[PDB]
Amino acid sequence: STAGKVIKCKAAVLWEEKKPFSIEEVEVAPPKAHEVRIKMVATGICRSDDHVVSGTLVTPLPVIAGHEAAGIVESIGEGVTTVRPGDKVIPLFTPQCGKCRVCKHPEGNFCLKNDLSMPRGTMQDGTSRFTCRGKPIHHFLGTSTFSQYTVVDEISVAKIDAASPLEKVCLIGCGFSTGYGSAVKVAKVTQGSTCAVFGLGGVGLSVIMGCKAAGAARIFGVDINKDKFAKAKEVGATECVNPQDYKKPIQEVLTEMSNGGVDFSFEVIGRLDTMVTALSCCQEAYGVSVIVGVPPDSQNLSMNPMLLLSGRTWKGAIFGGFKSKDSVPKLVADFMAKKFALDPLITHVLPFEKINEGFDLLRSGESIRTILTF
Amino acid sequence: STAGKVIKCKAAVLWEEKKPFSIEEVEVAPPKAHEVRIKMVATGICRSDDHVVSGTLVTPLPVIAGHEAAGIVESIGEGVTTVRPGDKVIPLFTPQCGKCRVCKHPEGNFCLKNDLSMPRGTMQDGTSRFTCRGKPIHHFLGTSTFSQYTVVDEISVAKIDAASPLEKVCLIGCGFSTGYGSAVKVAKVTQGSTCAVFGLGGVGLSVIMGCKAAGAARIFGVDINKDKFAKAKEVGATECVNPQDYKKPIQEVLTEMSNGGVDFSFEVIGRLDTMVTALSCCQEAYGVSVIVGVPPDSQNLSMNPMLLLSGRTWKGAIFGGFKSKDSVPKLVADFMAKKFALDPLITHVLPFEKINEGFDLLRSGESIRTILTF
Ligand SMILES: NC(=O)c1ccc[n+]([C@@H]2O[C@H](COP(=O)([O-])OP(=O)([O-])OC[C@H]3O[C@@H](n4cnc5c(N)[nH+]cnc54)[C@H](O)[C@@H]3O)[C@@H](O)[C@H]2O)c1
Ligand SMILES: NC(=O)c1ccc[n+]([C@@H]2O[C@H](COP(=O)([O-])OP(=O)([O-])OC[C@H]3O[C@@H](n4cnc5c(N)[nH+]cnc54)[C@H](O)[C@@H]3O)[C@@H](O)[C@H]2O)c1
Ligand SMILES: OCc1c(F)c(F)c(F)c(F)c1F
Ligand SMILES: OCc1c(F)c(F)c(F)c(F)c1F
Ligand SMILES: [Zn+2]
Ligand SMILES: [Zn+2]
Ligand SMILES: [Zn+2]
Ligand SMILES: [Zn+2]
């Protein structure tokens, strides 16, 4: 009896950069063909959502952000075959259309239907399902999870285990999967190796988790906030270092600590300088460095290509290299079987209505993940 | 006998940048412990040797350059076990000590004993075996092949098949092995893939050979000198393109040609701009780009890390990723077994005394490899 009808509900609308979200009523159109309307249950605050506020990440405004979430299907449009009303689902900010050259490639996951490279802030059909104050409001990465209801394309949603705890498994929608996959799938961390992880937020902790799962012998956590070190050790960091404590640049420090460079390094911050430092600190002949952090819009880094010529490998990835729709249900199943833990990432819980407090907690350095409940 | 005695012989000395080689008499000391003195038979002219002349590469002068060569052992120092007087050998400009962390690593080949990173222009012991007009002359990459006799450390020489034609297999000492290994070992080019090769000199042609050998379906040769195209097609290029023919940047052209980007790209020139263009032209989600060219000293490139975040892999390598002492004898054996051709790389064969004329041929665009015969 809400099926086929416009739903009025509360969402967190971002009208302008560098402003608080406005929690207010929006209108959510019913799903069109191959679309799915989802009642949100839990959503995490990822630093990439903050990047939209700060203008680090440029996407059309006004917008309903949010991309790390889980909820329950309210209704499905014509021709949907992969979810049903009442199913538990995770929106996929990286789609999996299953048809494009990337989806068909054994390794690739950055599906060509993504809204990340050149954001339009729309559904796949170039239109919006959201109205607020009578004005159209942009989507974000096809997900727009900061709303009591959202509409996503079918290629941007995965059915998950019906017994899943949504307030935990929402993290599988971005931070955990990204960090863990960056280590196990993208870098392919090896048993006995030495790893360095730059940035010990939600995603960097997940990288550490993945490095420890892959059997790394030494895992160096690097952060300018020493308050982040205790938790990093808890999830597998063997040593933590704060660049501020040292006279030498940290790439030199880490090279010394690793007797000539690390096997695998990860940038999980989003700064051009730490992307280069992270590359430099991996062993010059065989080291691998993975960029996970999101850089500031349109800015280029400068580097000496001799860092590569010696034999380093440099790569980046979205969503841990996981093919999203294939991978998310499996990751949930694995979580339900206790193959990895999510609680170490969750430091704060708040109602959706306190979204701004949640962002304050992230910006202050106090939280890892705050989970918002609808 | 010459063993244990200084040899007076002819070498090509480079007294200063941007001048002709001086062909004149030098004194070559006998080998010390773990050293090998080699009578040179044939040496190729590699663009890297030109970079020493041009100042693109910085290495101490005065110098005896040359690193792509083959000869016959004249004498050995105490303690040498891997070669004997009379053996055919190839000097190894990337050593293989067998003891360092890189030599012990299954993938790495940039042995920590190399003289490339921080060139000293000496023997492993920090001294020189060469004098000319009473002045010490530096070595180059532990090899110094532009001389009738050179002295190399044992870790910088490999014994090869006694029946090898030295005037051909000298190419295994640099250009062939570098290009071929860059394709087959570093990129790990796959069957049915699309490849783009920037630069169609000796090394880029060898990259093409490797891509074809690895079963690439399409191989795009890219050069501003259209005279290089015929030979590129002979060795496997399926299409050749000259960036100067197009109004659009060539990365865009190549992306269109490859219906969204290539599987593997190779920079085989040594320009910062083409390194970035080569990266960009590989498919954004799963593409791999390998830097082979040597860039001008101390210059940084500028790039947008979003090219990596989407999923690209960027890497570089020295000597095709090959562990040099293990690999060079096997490559020579494979050549003798007709597994690959070297003649397509050889455009000119000149006596050593015409070294300058050979560099002029390279610089004018007219040659691929000139082989100099002693
Ligand atoms: N590639 C992907 O798919 C993907 C997915 C998730 C998040 N991201 C990005 O990954 C980054 C981390 O996200 P997150 O974990 O939620 O963020 P976060 O919780 O802000 O963590 C970042 C950490 O970096 C630390 N830091 C800041 N500056 C420095 C410095 N100069 N040196 C060392 N440490 C420093 C900081 O103290 C904090 O603990 C952000 O840029 C995100 O946008 C990318
Ligand atoms: N990584 C290694 O171990 C290694 C080994 C051997 C050589 N190298 C380097 O690899 C590069 C190629 O060496 P080579 O094959 O002897 O040199 P080469 O024979 O001069 O070939 C270079 C080719 O690049 C072409 N070229 C120049 N500018 C451009 C441009 N803007 N766009 C397209 N094509 C262009 C040029 O026409 C020529 O055919 C040089 O920088 C060498 O120093 C590196
Ligand atoms: O945190 C995941 C995430 C990314 F990795 C991006 F590259 C991006 F543009 C974005 F909006 C985002 F949410
Ligand atoms: O051509 C091989 C070669 C290189 F790949 C270098 F990086 C270098 F510095 C050099 F001197 C050289 F000869
Ligand atoms: Zn797709
Ligand atoms: Zn995220
Ligand atoms: Zn070594
Ligand atoms: Zn060379």
Contact in structure between A12 and A351 (CB atoms under 8 Å): no
CA distance A92 to A115: 11
Residue B66: C-alpha distances to residues A306, B21, B181 (Å): 21, 11, 21
- CA B208-B342-B319 angle, to 5 degrees, is 65
Write out chain A residues lying below 8 Å of B302, CB-based. 300-302
Annotation-wise, does B195 bind a ligand?
A: no
CA distance B24 to B131: 11
Q: Annotated active-site positions of A, please?
A: 46, 48, 51, 67, 174
Strands B35-44 and B149-153: antiparallel
Alpha helices, DSSP H only, in A157-270?
166-169, 175-181, 202-213, 229-234, 250-257
Question: Is the CB of B46 within 6 Å of ligand 2?
Answer: yes
Please state whether the peptide bond connecting residue B20 to the residue before it is cis, i.e. omega within 30 degrees of 0. Answer: no
Task: Please report the residues numbered 229 through 248 in chain B whose beta carbons come closer than 8 angstroms to any beta carbon of chain A.
Answer: none
Atom of ligand 1 nearest to the CA of A319: 3
DSSP state of B238: S
Resolution in angstroms comes to 1.4
Contact in structure between A197 and A170 (CB atoms under 8 Å): no
**What tokens does B117 get?**
């990173």
Select the residue from B264, B276, B303, B309 to test the A interface by mutation, using most A Cβ atoms within 10 A: B309
B48 is catalytic: yes
Question: Is the CB of A319 within 6 Å of ligand 3?
Answer: no
- Ligand 1 centroid – CA A208 distance (Å): 13
Annotation-wise, does B204 bind a ligand?
A: yes
Nearest Cα residue to B117 out of B141, B144, B152, B145: B141
Atom of ligand 2 nearest to the CA of B225: 37
Residue type, B370: T
Tokens 């790569």, residue located = A315
Q: Which of B45, B110, B294, B328 to mutate to test the pocket of ligand 4 (most atoms within 8 A of CB)?
A: B294
Question: Is the CB of A67 within 6 Å of ligand 3?
Answer: yes
Task: Please report the residues numbered 114 through 153 in chain A whose beta carbons come closer than 8 angstroms to any beta carbon of chain B.
Answer: 117
Alpha helices, DSSP H only, in B122-226?
166-169, 175-181, 202-213
CA distance A201 to B353: 64
CA distance B152 to B325: 13
**What tokens does B114 get?**
């190399």
- Please state, as a whole number, how many other Cβ atoms lie within 10 Å of the Cβ of residue B234: 12
Q: What 3-state class would DSSP assign to B75? A: strand
Which neighbouring-strand residues pair with A222?
A: A198, A241
- Which residues, 6 or more positions from B6, have their beta carbon under 8 angstroms from its beta carbon? B27, B28, B29, B30
Write out chain A residues lying below 8 Å of B259, CB-based. 101
**What domains are defined for chain A?**
1-178+318-374 (3.90.180.10), 179-317 (3.40.50.720)
Experimental method: X-ray
Q: What 3-state class would DSSP assign to A238? A: coil
CA distance B365 to B237: 19
Please judge whether A314 and B309 are an interchain contact, meaning their C-beta atoms are less than 8 angstroms apart: no
Annotation-wise, does B294 bind a ligand?
A: yes
Alpha helices, DSSP H only, in chain B?
47-54, 166-169, 175-181, 202-213, 229-234, 250-257, 272-281, 306-309, 324-336, 355-363
Please judge whether A260 and B304 are an interchain contact, meaning their C-beta atoms are less than 8 angstroms apart: no
- Ligand 6 centroid – CA B330 distance (Å): 49
List the residue whose alpha carbon is closest to atom 16 of ligand 1: A47
Q: Nearest residue on chain A to B186, judged by CA atoms?
A: A311
CA distance B71 to A260: 35
Annotation-wise, does A294 bind a ligand?
A: yes
CA distance B114 to B122: 11
Question: Is the CB of A46 within 6 Å of ligand 3?
Answer: yes
CA distance A211 to A187: 9
- Ligand 8 centroid – CA B59 distance (Å): 14
Please judge whether A303 and B300 are an interchain contact, meaning their C-beta atoms are less than 8 angstroms apart: yes
CA distance B40 to B144: 10
B294-299 LR contacts (CB < 8 Å, sep 24+): B294/A309, B294/B47, B294/B48, B294/B51, B294/B56, B294/B57, B294/B270, B295/A305, B295/A306, B295/A309, B295/B56, B295/B270, B295/B271, B296/B56, B296/B270, B296/B272, B297/B55, B297/B56, B297/B57, B297/B58, B298/A304, B298/B58, B299/A304, B299/B272
